[PDB]
Write a protein that binds this DNA or RNA. Structure first.
Ligand code: IRI
Ligand code: IRI
Ligand code: IRI
Ligand code: K
Length: 14
RNA sequence: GCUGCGGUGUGGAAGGAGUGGCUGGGUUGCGCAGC
């Protein structure tokens, strides 16, 4: 899971 | 690789899903969960 580790709205970027 | 829950806070009890996010923690951190 090399991608978004946290979702829902705008959580999890960088 | 994608997605969901203001669920977390060195403010988190007057808030939210960033319609404050070049105003910070934080290039949306942390936790939990699902495909
Ligand atoms: N969960 Ir309380 N954050 N710890 N609301 N009880 N203060
Ligand atoms: N400038 Ir800033 N926005 N505060 N360090 N990049 N995070
Ligand atoms: N501007 Ir900012 N919000 N502080 N993107 N660098 N993290
Ligand atoms: K805040």
């Amino acid at each position: 899971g090399d991608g978004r580790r946290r979702g829902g709205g705008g959580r999890g970027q960088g």
